[PDB]
Design a protein around this ligand. Structure first.
Ligand code: D48
Length: 222
């Protein structure tokens, strides 16, 4: 398949990303608590459902939530201010809460079943969100870094296999603050550092210029 791109909702961020996040890729956004990573996830879950002329892929979404941060009412707001029907947008987001890191890993295997079901339809899965990818692994493997890295490595390998095999954009969030961070090392296809700036602006930089955007009723925008 060719490489598809999903607009983030921000012309600035899209330019930094060469058009948007890519299918057949894992995009990892990392930054401190409150930097806007989950807002970007919510926005992408709407943007992907637009037609290509508007920066989407007419795609369905699968969302794995580890922190109970998915908000359907926020999806509704973004959709209504992106000219989409909110009920239709929510109907094309498959949502699951991961209870722990082992359940999170099983959910990725379960996602493949729905990906296969929708593959030949007019609304194939084009976006798989894992928010937060690292939170359960971090809490469960305190004092056991070597074992944590083994499990994370397999999890990321599973996500890579889905991205490439089924032409999906995988978007993952990772909280990194004071003293923290191996990030995801070199595992993602693309690392995006997100931070707060003056006056509520958000600033994005590729790790390995900078885009600037705001969180609004449209999700994010310049
Ligand atoms: O209905 C489902 C929703 C999911 C969401 C995320 C990951 C896996 C899922 C599997 C489902 O059957």
């Amino acid at each position: 398949a060719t490489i598809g791109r999903i607009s983030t909702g921000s012309k600035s961020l899209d330019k930094l990303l060469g058009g948007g996040i890519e299918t057949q890729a894992i995009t990892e956004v990392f930054g401190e608590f409150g930097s806007g990573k989950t807002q970007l996830a919510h926005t992408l879950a709407v943007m992907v459902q637009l037609p290509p002329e508007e920066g989407g892929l007419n795609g369905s979404v699968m969302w794995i939530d580890t922190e109970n941060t998915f908000r359907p009412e926020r999806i509704r707001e973004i959709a209504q201010n992106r000219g989409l029907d909110p009920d239709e947008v929510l109907k094309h987001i498959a949502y699951a809460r991961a209870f722990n890191s082992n359940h999170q890993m099983l959910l990725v295997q379960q996602a493949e079943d729905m990906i296969k079901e929708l593959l030949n339809t007019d609304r194939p899965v084009k976006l798989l969100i894992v928010d937060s990818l690292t939170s359960h692994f971090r809490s469960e493997y305190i004092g056991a870094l070597a074992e944590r890295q083994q499990k994370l490595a397999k999890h990321l390998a599973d996500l890579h296999r889905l991205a490439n095999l089924y032409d999906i954009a995988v978007f993952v969030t990772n909280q990194v603050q004071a003293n923290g961070g191996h990030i995801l090392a070199h595992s993602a296809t693309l690392r995006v550092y997100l931070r707060k700036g003056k006056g509520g602006k958000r600033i994005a930089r590729l790790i390995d210029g900078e885009a600037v955007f705001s969180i609004t009723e449209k999700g994010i925008e310049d």
